[PDB]
Amino acid sequence: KSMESVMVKYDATVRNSINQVVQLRYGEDGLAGESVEFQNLATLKPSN
Amino acid sequence: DREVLRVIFPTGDSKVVLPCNLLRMIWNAQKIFHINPRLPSDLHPIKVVEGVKELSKKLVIVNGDDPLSRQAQENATLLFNIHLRSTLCSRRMAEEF
Amino acid sequence: XXXXXXXXXXXXXXXXXXXXXXXXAQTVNLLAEWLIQTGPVQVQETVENHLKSLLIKHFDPRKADSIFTEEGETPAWLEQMIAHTTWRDLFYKLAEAHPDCLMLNFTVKLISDAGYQGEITSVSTACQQLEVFSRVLRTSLATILDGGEENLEKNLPEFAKMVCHGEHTYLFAQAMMSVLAQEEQGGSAVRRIAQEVQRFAQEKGHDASQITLALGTAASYPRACQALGAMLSKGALNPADITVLFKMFTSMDPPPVELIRVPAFLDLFMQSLFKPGARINQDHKHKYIHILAYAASVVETWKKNKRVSINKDELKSTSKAVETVHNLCCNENSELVAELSTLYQCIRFPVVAMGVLKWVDWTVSEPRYFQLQTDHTPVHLALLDEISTCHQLLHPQVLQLLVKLFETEHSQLDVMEQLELKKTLLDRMVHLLSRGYVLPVVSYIRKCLEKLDTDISLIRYFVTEVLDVIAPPYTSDFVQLFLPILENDSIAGTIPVTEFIAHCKSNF
Amino acid sequence: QGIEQISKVYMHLPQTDNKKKIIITEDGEFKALQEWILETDGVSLMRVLSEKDVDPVRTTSNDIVEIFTVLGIEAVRKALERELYHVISFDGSYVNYRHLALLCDTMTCRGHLMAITRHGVNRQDTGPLMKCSFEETVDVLMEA
Amino acid sequence: XXXXXXXXXXXXXXXXXXXXXXXXXXXXXXXXXGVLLPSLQSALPFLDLHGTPRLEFHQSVFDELRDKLLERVSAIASAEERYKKLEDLLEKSFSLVKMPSLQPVVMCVMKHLPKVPEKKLKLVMADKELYRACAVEVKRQIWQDNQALFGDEVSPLLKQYILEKESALFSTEFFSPSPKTRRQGEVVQRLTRMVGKNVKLYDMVLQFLRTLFLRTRNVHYCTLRAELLMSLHDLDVGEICTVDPCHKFTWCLDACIRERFVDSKRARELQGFLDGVKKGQEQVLGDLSMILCDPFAINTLALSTVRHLQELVGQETLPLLLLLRLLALGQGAWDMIDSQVFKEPKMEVELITRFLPMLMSFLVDDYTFNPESFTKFLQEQRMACEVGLYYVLHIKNALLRLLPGLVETFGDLGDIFLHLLTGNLALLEDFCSSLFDGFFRKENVHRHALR
Amino acid sequence: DDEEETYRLWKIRKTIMQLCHDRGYLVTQDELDQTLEEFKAQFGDKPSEGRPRRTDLTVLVAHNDDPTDQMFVFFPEEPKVGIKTIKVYCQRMQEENITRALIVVQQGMTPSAKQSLVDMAPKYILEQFLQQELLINITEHELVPEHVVMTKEEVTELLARYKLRENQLPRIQAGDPVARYFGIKRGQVVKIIRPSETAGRYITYRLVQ
């Protein structure tokens, strides 16, 4: 009941029923959560 | 990009959640086109660089040519572009993949 | 060689071009002296390094062989490039990059014949010729004989890696050790360094038991030699060979005690007997104990060819001590403190003390041990204390076990429980320091202070415990090794110490 | 001695690298330094952060309210994220960051902490009908 | 073709190898030419066995010994000992002027604290003849020596005037609104071409530019002075800002006027700075020139005057903000027409009150709904207030009534093109605006582009 | 202790220098990071009854955009600040051309003084800061992301790009600690840049209400 009306609008922003923006992009990247995967960054960890 | 990553992840935890599984896609490309790893390749590294740049231009989350829109687009795809330039770099495409 | 090209032409066009090119150094000298004034040795060193990079960078597979086709006496680029301390480094690097080169091997033999060794490079330059390897090996064991125990611990890795590069190199090294070990004086040092080389070869995965049975005059009796060879090669104590050796050693004529005193065999016996998870059958248990007592009890007098006196009086007491301690090792569950005084009288023998040390190592290094210990100090640490008290030869083993436990992270304990465990191990370290083994312990605390992330409170506790038991005078080495940990700006302010720093300031 | 409403303080070395001091070495390598941290019973951020030899950058709280009153609304958004992630992934389970981020952004979008009750959801400009669909339908419709 | 000792040795070698046989002579010359500690002869047959390049070795060692430790040269350049070492290096490298002296010139430029004019005159002559790469030190020496830097600044001043004229001709849809930050162009490069911490040369260049813009120049000049002062203030030029006592204060006031255009505190600061000012010869004539030559500052002052007139009409207190605006307009009207002491003949109280009553009556008529004599008096009166009146009129029944007044003022009275463009961009009324524009080469082009 | 008090005063001055530099006022680099011993040498190390009094620690700084925009940092001697000392500070500002001030109070102010500070807020902008609240910099905390105050043209361009009104943005209270740190009033928009583990970087905009 807190956030039932919160949705992605057609300008790819996230807004409630008051038309107030909650997120400028969904999940801050604009991607759906069902199509993302656990990946490893090969550049963060190794030494210089 | 490495310095930006080490700012973003102060702990060295490289396991992130990103849309396109680049390692599996490279493996799929190896299996589909019958890539022999023992042989020299016919892929110019400058084509790798320019292809990664054009692909990064294609992946658009925030539309618009405004500086605000350009900054929002660069921020929204920052992690994925870093992962793409890291995975699809010239040295790795020359040696490993 | 532009003059040669000029004299070998005077087509004319290319000749004139090359002449103009050659006519197209002193400005480099002007820049060098300007930099010397603005700065001396560094400029010439960087110039020589850039020259060495240019010489290395392209190739040299056969051109030096082509100039050596005329046997290459040529002292012009030999004596100019043989003693400037940097070109021989280039030649070692080139020989490492390009092995089996005739001219490179000739230059290596030339730089070895001048006694200018000092680079290991064990792949190509060290072990290619008998002369070069012999001279670098002679320098190596001269250094290991001059340095002492500290140089032993700091130098057996690279030296034993260089002499175990090939089986022929190991054979030559063990040949020199076997020849030098029969000298009347100083043979114990040679036997020791040979033993660490042999154990390095053993832990490197290469079989070296055949060398140490053949070259150590232990092949007088072929049956016992074959049994001991199978013993050392298989890496376990088998009943057949111990029965053969026991029935031979109980005979009317005893064999020499040299082959049964091999440290590899005795260490493997320690693995077999004093392991907590070992169940030796009773029909060979007394054979094992009698073998150990004979190996570590007899007093033998030798005059240059044979023996006339062998003493077995201490054999009974040694066998009783080892039997009692083996019964304790097979007892496991309390019942240890019930008759612990007898255990301390058995620790008075050194072989029993090393067996107890290995048993303590296996009992304590097993995980979830301190988690099941209720008392403030474990009893096995007190066994280590008595081992350090009775004997001084086992002090490096005690310190090795203590640093193994001190570096071990026990995630199953509370943080204060870990801290008091480290304090207990450090109390054992303080006892080891008080029993004469001083310098390596302070060296380890120095290592823990700056290049390790140990607790500063532990270092302060060590300093407090040491300074409450030591009194002046002190030597120069102990003061030089103990002063920097007391002036580290994380110890002196919090931490009497005023008397010690006053004595060190007034005396040193 | 001490600070009021700080009853008991425990000290321990962290085991997981979440609370270990991670540094980048001279050769660009991540190293986990085991350093002492203090966990208290009872909370007062602003006095503890001011103490000598207490890190004012990493010292945080479980208490959402004092983090909001001391460090602000974006900091309490991040702290709410971290607390929800802890209470979700303590048992090893995983939830996508989109849902946690959306919950924290909905609870922190109005400047104050919007509690998920009748006292935070039925107090914004969401209209009478969707407010009365949640709770106190008669009171909400009477006020409207 | 670098001479010196090396050139002399080359000439000697050329004279020696001038025929007459001597095959051993060439070899001796090649061997004598190998720097020190003759192990290079030992390294020679290692390189001779595969088609010996000596030029490659010489260029490689020259390139490394220059490029690798030019950083060391800069480090020893970056006080007395380093300056002496830089002077010794410059004295050593002065003989290699004909020789390639990229590093030899950079070594002197890094330690360029001591001028050394005895060799500095020859260095400046060689730099003028050969177009040397010494940018900062060369520009500082040219500014301190003679008017060559004056000629370079006069050329940039002419380029800036041409750019301003082209921008005025190239009309577009608010008198090009841009503050000192966003207007970083055509003077940031000139500011970097300045000496930096050179108060005397920069002050002389600014005085020459102001004199050229005043005596024989338009009002387009003297705004570059404000632009360079703002660039130096944002560039952290402490010495140049601290040289002018009131220049930094009036530049800060001008920046505050350009940022907002409505501020009583800025007006109070400007009045306080003008009250305790020095004599009109020094710091007064320059301040008047800076006020007059500022076109964007003049537009900001006109907008502030319009806002103050609107505030006075709302308050109904016609007869200190309006007085401050009038004093600022009188100070910034013009001072480069005649060179003399600082005088402020302005503030026509009766004419100002008559002009303000017309705007107040127009505003009252526009408020009540939702002339020719006032326009004739403005055309036959002070045009400084006429520009503000036109700007106020450019930006229902009141507008229709004031349109005939704007048409009458258009037929009565250089700077009117920008005001007309601003009124057309800010603004039934289109037909009246087109009729006013057609009732009169930049103005015709702007009228054609608007319609 | 007394050296503890001068350490606390040095820390408060350090936070004031960092705050004024972050707010855009001209603060020199050496003042931005001066050590404790430099504070003792400059001011006196004995704030009990000696040299570094609270009156001596008053800081006047000017903005980088216009020198007319100046701001005081007043340090009252008394723990609890009343009406009369506020009137003294307002008299000190009214004899100058300076309309902004921070009042670094030791104990909490009286409610009459607080509502007084509310009263002349359109004329003189006086901000009250507790002694505890300035012993650290909250913006240096790892939970607090980067806050950048947007100019009015930036706000208009932001609202024009996403086609949203001012009330549609997420908001931040004027009593927020970071909003009080940056001294930002209602109707002003702060942009917030924080790292993200799904996108890398995220910029959100909060409007002060």
Side-chain angles (χ1 to χ4, degrees), chain C residues 3 21 25-29 34-35 50-51 54 59 77 87 91, chain E residues 32-33 35-36 39 42-43 45 49-50 55 57 60 62 64 69:
Chain C
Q26 277 77 14
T27 315
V28 190
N29 289 293
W34 287 334
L35 196 58
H50 179 250
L51 195 156
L54 290 179
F59 56 91
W77 60 87
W87 298 56
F91 272 92
Chain E
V35 297
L36 280 175
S39 56
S42 73
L49 278 154
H50 319 97
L55 278 81
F57 181 76
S60 65
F62 267 125
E64 61 86 20
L69 280 77

mmCIF file of all heavy atoms in Angstrom, chain C residues 3 21 25-29 34-35 50-51 54 59 63 77 87 91, chain E residues 32-33 35-36 39 42-43 45 49-50 55 57 60 62 64 69 92, unseen atoms left out:
data_model
loop_
_atom_site.group_PDB
_atom_site.id
_atom_site.type_symbol
_atom_site.label_atom_id
_atom_site.label_comp_id
_atom_site.label_asym_id
_atom_site.label_seq_id
_atom_site.Cartn_x
_atom_site.Cartn_y
_atom_site.Cartn_z
ATOM 1 N N UNK C 3 85.119 3.856 -41.711
ATOM 2 C CA UNK C 3 86.423 3.971 -42.350
ATOM 3 C C UNK C 3 86.717 2.726 -43.180
ATOM 4 O O UNK C 3 87.333 2.810 -44.241
ATOM 5 C CB UNK C 3 87.519 4.184 -41.306
ATOM 6 N N UNK C 21 76.902 10.454 -44.079
ATOM 7 C CA UNK C 21 76.186 10.015 -42.887
ATOM 8 C C UNK C 21 77.117 9.918 -41.678
ATOM 9 O O UNK C 21 76.764 10.344 -40.578
ATOM 10 C CB UNK C 21 75.511 8.667 -43.146
ATOM 11 N N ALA C 25 78.039 13.235 -29.984
ATOM 12 C CA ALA C 25 79.182 12.704 -29.250
ATOM 13 C C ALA C 25 79.733 13.739 -28.275
ATOM 14 O O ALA C 25 79.585 13.600 -27.061
ATOM 15 C CB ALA C 25 80.267 12.250 -30.215
ATOM 16 N N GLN C 26 80.376 14.777 -28.816
ATOM 17 C CA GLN C 26 80.916 15.838 -27.974
ATOM 18 C C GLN C 26 79.810 16.673 -27.342
ATOM 19 O O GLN C 26 79.971 17.163 -26.218
ATOM 20 C CB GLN C 26 81.860 16.723 -28.787
ATOM 21 C CG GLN C 26 83.275 16.176 -28.907
ATOM 22 C CD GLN C 26 83.387 15.047 -29.916
ATOM 23 O OE1 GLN C 26 82.479 14.821 -30.717
ATOM 24 N NE2 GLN C 26 84.506 14.333 -29.883
ATOM 25 N N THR C 27 78.690 16.849 -28.048
ATOM 26 C CA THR C 27 77.530 17.511 -27.457
ATOM 27 C C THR C 27 76.947 16.689 -26.314
ATOM 28 O O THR C 27 76.458 17.256 -25.329
ATOM 29 C CB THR C 27 76.470 17.768 -28.530
ATOM 30 O OG1 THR C 27 77.096 18.301 -29.704
ATOM 31 C CG2 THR C 27 75.423 18.755 -28.034
ATOM 32 N N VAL C 28 76.998 15.358 -26.424
ATOM 33 C CA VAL C 28 76.590 14.495 -25.318
ATOM 34 C C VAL C 28 77.502 14.706 -24.116
ATOM 35 O O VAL C 28 77.043 14.733 -22.968
ATOM 36 C CB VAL C 28 76.577 13.021 -25.765
ATOM 37 C CG1 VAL C 28 75.927 12.146 -24.705
ATOM 38 C CG2 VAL C 28 75.863 12.875 -27.100
ATOM 39 N N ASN C 29 78.807 14.873 -24.361
ATOM 40 C CA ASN C 29 79.744 15.157 -23.278
ATOM 41 C C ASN C 29 79.461 16.512 -22.639
ATOM 42 O O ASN C 29 79.563 16.664 -21.415
ATOM 43 C CB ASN C 29 81.179 15.110 -23.802
ATOM 44 C CG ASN C 29 81.634 13.705 -24.132
ATOM 45 O OD1 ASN C 29 81.780 12.862 -23.248
ATOM 46 N ND2 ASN C 29 81.870 13.449 -25.413
ATOM 47 N N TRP C 34 77.384 19.549 -18.096
ATOM 48 C CA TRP C 34 76.400 20.518 -17.622
ATOM 49 C C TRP C 34 75.499 19.905 -16.558
ATOM 50 O O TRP C 34 75.169 20.557 -15.561
ATOM 51 C CB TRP C 34 75.561 21.034 -18.790
ATOM 52 C CG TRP C 34 76.288 21.972 -19.695
ATOM 53 C CD1 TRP C 34 77.341 22.773 -19.371
ATOM 54 C CD2 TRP C 34 76.013 22.209 -21.080
ATOM 55 N NE1 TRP C 34 77.741 23.495 -20.470
ATOM 56 C CE2 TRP C 34 76.942 23.165 -21.532
ATOM 57 C CE3 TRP C 34 75.072 21.702 -21.982
ATOM 58 C CZ2 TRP C 34 76.957 23.628 -22.847
ATOM 59 C CZ3 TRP C 34 75.089 22.161 -23.287
ATOM 60 C CH2 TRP C 34 76.024 23.115 -23.706
ATOM 61 N N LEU C 35 75.095 18.649 -16.754
ATOM 62 C CA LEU C 35 74.282 17.953 -15.766
ATOM 63 C C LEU C 35 75.075 17.627 -14.506
ATOM 64 O O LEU C 35 74.507 17.608 -13.406
ATOM 65 C CB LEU C 35 73.714 16.680 -16.386
ATOM 66 C CG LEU C 35 72.560 15.972 -15.689
ATOM 67 C CD1 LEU C 35 71.371 16.900 -15.538
ATOM 68 C CD2 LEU C 35 72.196 14.757 -16.508
ATOM 69 N N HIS C 50 71.296 2.607 -20.765
ATOM 70 C CA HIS C 50 70.682 2.781 -22.079
ATOM 71 C C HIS C 50 71.473 2.043 -23.156
ATOM 72 O O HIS C 50 70.889 1.440 -24.066
ATOM 73 C CB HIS C 50 70.567 4.274 -22.393
ATOM 74 C CG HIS C 50 69.975 4.575 -23.734
ATOM 75 N ND1 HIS C 50 70.713 5.096 -24.774
ATOM 76 C CD2 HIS C 50 68.711 4.438 -24.201
ATOM 77 C CE1 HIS C 50 69.929 5.267 -25.824
ATOM 78 N NE2 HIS C 50 68.710 4.871 -25.504
ATOM 79 N N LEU C 51 72.806 2.059 -23.044
ATOM 80 C CA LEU C 51 73.659 1.295 -23.950
ATOM 81 C C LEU C 51 73.407 -0.204 -23.814
ATOM 82 O O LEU C 51 73.370 -0.927 -24.816
ATOM 83 C CB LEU C 51 75.127 1.625 -23.663
ATOM 84 C CG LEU C 51 76.275 1.277 -24.619
ATOM 85 C CD1 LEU C 51 77.423 2.224 -24.347
ATOM 86 C CD2 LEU C 51 76.761 -0.161 -24.478
ATOM 87 N N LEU C 54 70.151 -1.037 -25.500
ATOM 88 C CA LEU C 54 70.309 -1.061 -26.953
ATOM 89 C C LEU C 54 71.061 -2.303 -27.422
ATOM 90 O O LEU C 54 70.763 -2.846 -28.491
ATOM 91 C CB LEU C 54 71.018 0.202 -27.435
ATOM 92 C CG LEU C 54 70.208 1.493 -27.343
ATOM 93 C CD1 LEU C 54 71.046 2.658 -27.819
ATOM 94 C CD2 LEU C 54 68.927 1.383 -28.155
ATOM 95 N N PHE C 59 68.970 -8.599 -31.064
ATOM 96 C CA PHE C 59 69.316 -10.020 -31.151
ATOM 97 C C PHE C 59 70.833 -10.158 -31.091
ATOM 98 O O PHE C 59 71.573 -9.191 -31.298
ATOM 99 C CB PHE C 59 68.778 -10.704 -32.425
ATOM 100 C CG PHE C 59 69.206 -10.043 -33.715
ATOM 101 C CD1 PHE C 59 70.357 -10.439 -34.376
ATOM 102 C CD2 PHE C 59 68.426 -9.050 -34.287
ATOM 103 C CE1 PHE C 59 70.735 -9.842 -35.560
ATOM 104 C CE2 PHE C 59 68.801 -8.447 -35.473
ATOM 105 C CZ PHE C 59 69.956 -8.845 -36.111
ATOM 106 N N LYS C 63 76.240 -13.994 -34.370
ATOM 107 C CA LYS C 63 77.300 -13.081 -34.792
ATOM 108 C C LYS C 63 78.538 -13.188 -33.912
ATOM 109 O O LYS C 63 79.666 -13.100 -34.414
ATOM 110 C CB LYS C 63 76.783 -11.646 -34.793
ATOM 111 N N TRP C 77 87.499 -5.883 -26.798
ATOM 112 C CA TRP C 77 86.170 -5.828 -26.207
ATOM 113 C C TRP C 77 85.970 -6.869 -25.116
ATOM 114 O O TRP C 77 84.847 -7.035 -24.631
ATOM 115 C CB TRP C 77 85.080 -5.964 -27.275
ATOM 116 C CG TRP C 77 85.075 -7.225 -28.076
ATOM 117 C CD1 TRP C 77 84.451 -8.394 -27.758
ATOM 118 C CD2 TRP C 77 85.648 -7.417 -29.376
ATOM 119 N NE1 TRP C 77 84.637 -9.319 -28.758
ATOM 120 C CE2 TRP C 77 85.366 -8.743 -29.764
ATOM 121 C CE3 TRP C 77 86.389 -6.605 -30.239
ATOM 122 C CZ2 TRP C 77 85.793 -9.271 -30.979
ATOM 123 C CZ3 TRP C 77 86.816 -7.132 -31.443
ATOM 124 C CH2 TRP C 77 86.519 -8.453 -31.802
ATOM 125 N N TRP C 87 78.712 -4.836 -17.613
ATOM 126 C CA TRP C 87 78.653 -5.578 -18.865
ATOM 127 C C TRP C 87 78.547 -7.077 -18.621
ATOM 128 O O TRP C 87 77.944 -7.795 -19.429
ATOM 129 C CB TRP C 87 79.869 -5.263 -19.742
ATOM 130 C CG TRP C 87 79.987 -3.816 -20.158
ATOM 131 C CD1 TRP C 87 80.035 -2.718 -19.342
ATOM 132 C CD2 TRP C 87 80.027 -3.316 -21.498
ATOM 133 N NE1 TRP C 87 80.127 -1.574 -20.091
ATOM 134 C CE2 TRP C 87 80.121 -1.912 -21.418
ATOM 135 C CE3 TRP C 87 80.001 -3.919 -22.759
ATOM 136 C CZ2 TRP C 87 80.187 -1.106 -22.546
ATOM 137 C CZ3 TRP C 87 80.072 -3.115 -23.878
ATOM 138 C CH2 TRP C 87 80.165 -1.723 -23.764
ATOM 139 N N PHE C 91 75.965 -9.863 -20.064
ATOM 140 C CA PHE C 91 76.300 -11.179 -20.600
ATOM 141 C C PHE C 91 75.530 -12.289 -19.889
ATOM 142 O O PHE C 91 75.118 -13.263 -20.529
ATOM 143 C CB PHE C 91 77.806 -11.415 -20.521
ATOM 144 C CG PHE C 91 78.552 -10.917 -21.727
ATOM 145 C CD1 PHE C 91 79.071 -9.633 -21.759
ATOM 146 C CD2 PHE C 91 78.705 -11.724 -22.843
ATOM 147 C CE1 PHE C 91 79.748 -9.170 -22.870
ATOM 148 C CE2 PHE C 91 79.380 -11.267 -23.959
ATOM 149 C CZ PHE C 91 79.903 -9.988 -23.973
ATOM 150 N N UNK E 32 88.286 9.850 -33.449
ATOM 151 C CA UNK E 32 88.393 11.016 -32.581
ATOM 152 C C UNK E 32 87.016 11.612 -32.311
ATOM 153 O O UNK E 32 86.803 12.272 -31.292
ATOM 154 N N UNK E 33 86.084 11.375 -33.229
ATOM 155 C CA UNK E 33 84.723 11.875 -33.083
ATOM 156 C C UNK E 33 83.954 11.044 -32.062
ATOM 157 O O UNK E 33 84.003 11.318 -30.862
ATOM 158 N N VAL E 35 82.352 8.848 -26.464
ATOM 159 C CA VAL E 35 82.216 10.070 -25.683
ATOM 160 C C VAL E 35 83.256 10.158 -24.563
ATOM 161 O O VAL E 35 84.047 11.101 -24.541
ATOM 162 C CB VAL E 35 80.761 10.234 -25.172
ATOM 163 C CG1 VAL E 35 79.832 10.364 -26.358
ATOM 164 C CG2 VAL E 35 80.261 9.029 -24.369
ATOM 165 N N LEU E 36 83.316 9.174 -23.664
ATOM 166 C CA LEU E 36 84.249 9.067 -22.548
ATOM 167 C C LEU E 36 84.228 7.624 -22.068
ATOM 168 O O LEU E 36 83.240 6.915 -22.285
ATOM 169 C CB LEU E 36 83.889 10.000 -21.379
ATOM 170 C CG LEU E 36 84.236 11.492 -21.386
ATOM 171 C CD1 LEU E 36 83.644 12.188 -20.171
ATOM 172 C CD2 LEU E 36 85.742 11.696 -21.448
ATOM 173 N N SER E 39 84.658 2.322 -23.545
ATOM 174 C CA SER E 39 83.999 1.040 -23.734
ATOM 175 C C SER E 39 83.008 1.067 -24.890
ATOM 176 O O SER E 39 82.453 0.019 -25.242
ATOM 177 C CB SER E 39 83.285 0.620 -22.445
ATOM 178 O OG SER E 39 82.367 1.614 -22.024
ATOM 179 N N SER E 42 84.435 -1.008 -27.341
ATOM 180 C CA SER E 42 84.147 -2.405 -27.035
ATOM 181 C C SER E 42 82.742 -2.790 -27.480
ATOM 182 O O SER E 42 82.510 -3.924 -27.913
ATOM 183 C CB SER E 42 84.331 -2.669 -25.540
ATOM 184 O OG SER E 42 83.285 -2.086 -24.785
ATOM 185 N N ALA E 43 81.790 -1.861 -27.375
ATOM 186 C CA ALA E 43 80.429 -2.114 -27.836
ATOM 187 C C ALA E 43 80.280 -1.989 -29.344
ATOM 188 O O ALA E 43 79.246 -2.403 -29.881
ATOM 189 C CB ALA E 43 79.452 -1.150 -27.162
ATOM 190 N N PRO E 45 81.892 -3.536 -32.120
ATOM 191 C CA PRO E 45 81.720 -4.723 -32.981
ATOM 192 C C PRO E 45 80.489 -5.554 -32.657
ATOM 193 O O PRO E 45 80.104 -6.392 -33.482
ATOM 194 C CB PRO E 45 83.013 -5.528 -32.750
ATOM 195 C CG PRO E 45 83.917 -4.630 -31.974
ATOM 196 C CD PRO E 45 83.005 -3.771 -31.182
ATOM 197 N N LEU E 49 78.216 -6.084 -36.538
ATOM 198 C CA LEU E 49 78.045 -7.371 -37.200
ATOM 199 C C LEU E 49 76.723 -7.501 -37.948
ATOM 200 O O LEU E 49 76.564 -8.457 -38.716
ATOM 201 C CB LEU E 49 78.185 -8.505 -36.180
ATOM 202 C CG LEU E 49 79.630 -8.905 -35.857
ATOM 203 C CD1 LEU E 49 79.745 -9.509 -34.465
ATOM 204 C CD2 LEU E 49 80.177 -9.863 -36.906
ATOM 205 N N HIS E 50 75.768 -6.582 -37.750
ATOM 206 C CA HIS E 50 74.529 -6.557 -38.536
ATOM 207 C C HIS E 50 74.286 -5.131 -39.030
ATOM 208 O O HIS E 50 73.515 -4.393 -38.411
ATOM 209 C CB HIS E 50 73.338 -7.067 -37.722
ATOM 210 C CG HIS E 50 73.646 -8.257 -36.870
ATOM 211 N ND1 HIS E 50 73.960 -8.150 -35.532
ATOM 212 C CD2 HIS E 50 73.693 -9.578 -37.165
ATOM 213 C CE1 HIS E 50 74.178 -9.355 -35.037
ATOM 214 N NE2 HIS E 50 74.023 -10.239 -36.007
ATOM 215 N N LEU E 55 74.139 6.445 -36.779
ATOM 216 C CA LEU E 55 73.175 7.533 -36.665
ATOM 217 C C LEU E 55 72.039 7.159 -35.726
ATOM 218 O O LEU E 55 71.558 8.001 -34.962
ATOM 219 C CB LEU E 55 72.626 7.898 -38.046
ATOM 220 C CG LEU E 55 73.459 8.827 -38.932
ATOM 221 C CD1 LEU E 55 74.564 8.061 -39.641
ATOM 222 C CD2 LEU E 55 72.573 9.544 -39.939
ATOM 223 N N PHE E 57 72.207 5.086 -33.124
ATOM 224 C CA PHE E 57 72.725 5.167 -31.761
ATOM 225 C C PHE E 57 72.866 6.611 -31.300
ATOM 226 O O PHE E 57 72.495 6.945 -30.167
ATOM 227 C CB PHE E 57 74.072 4.449 -31.662
ATOM 228 C CG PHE E 57 74.658 4.457 -30.278
ATOM 229 C CD1 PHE E 57 74.157 3.622 -29.296
ATOM 230 C CD2 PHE E 57 75.706 5.307 -29.957
ATOM 231 C CE1 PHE E 57 74.690 3.629 -28.019
ATOM 232 C CE2 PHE E 57 76.242 5.319 -28.681
ATOM 233 C CZ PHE E 57 75.731 4.479 -27.713
ATOM 234 N N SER E 60 69.440 8.144 -30.766
ATOM 235 C CA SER E 60 68.815 7.552 -29.588
ATOM 236 C C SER E 60 69.391 8.126 -28.300
ATOM 237 O O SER E 60 68.635 8.472 -27.383
ATOM 238 C CB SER E 60 68.977 6.032 -29.613
ATOM 239 O OG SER E 60 70.341 5.666 -29.514
ATOM 240 N N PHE E 62 70.981 11.008 -27.926
ATOM 241 C CA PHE E 62 70.590 12.415 -27.856
ATOM 242 C C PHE E 62 69.150 12.567 -27.381
ATOM 243 O O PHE E 62 68.862 13.386 -26.497
ATOM 244 C CB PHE E 62 70.762 13.074 -29.225
ATOM 245 C CG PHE E 62 72.089 13.750 -29.417
ATOM 246 C CD1 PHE E 62 72.895 13.426 -30.498
ATOM 247 C CD2 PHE E 62 72.525 14.719 -28.527
ATOM 248 C CE1 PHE E 62 74.115 14.048 -30.682
ATOM 249 C CE2 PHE E 62 73.744 15.344 -28.707
ATOM 250 C CZ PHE E 62 74.539 15.006 -29.787
ATOM 251 N N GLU E 64 67.253 10.400 -25.645
ATOM 252 C CA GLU E 64 67.049 10.024 -24.249
ATOM 253 C C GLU E 64 67.661 11.051 -23.301
ATOM 254 O O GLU E 64 66.996 11.482 -22.351
ATOM 255 C CB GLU E 64 67.567 8.602 -23.975
ATOM 256 C CG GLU E 64 69.050 8.317 -24.193
ATOM 257 C CD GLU E 64 69.925 8.646 -22.998
ATOM 258 O OE1 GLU E 64 69.394 8.745 -21.873
ATOM 259 O OE2 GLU E 64 71.148 8.806 -23.188
ATOM 260 N N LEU E 69 65.571 13.688 -18.980
ATOM 261 C CA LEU E 69 65.971 14.553 -17.880
ATOM 262 C C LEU E 69 65.726 16.033 -18.153
ATOM 263 O O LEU E 69 66.234 16.879 -17.407
ATOM 264 C CB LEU E 69 67.439 14.316 -17.496
ATOM 265 C CG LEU E 69 67.705 13.084 -16.610
ATOM 266 C CD1 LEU E 69 67.680 11.752 -17.364
ATOM 267 C CD2 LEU E 69 68.981 13.222 -15.803
ATOM 268 N N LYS E 92 75.728 28.413 -21.117
ATOM 269 C CA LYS E 92 76.287 27.318 -21.903
ATOM 270 C C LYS E 92 75.509 27.097 -23.196
ATOM 271 O O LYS E 92 76.104 26.818 -24.243
#
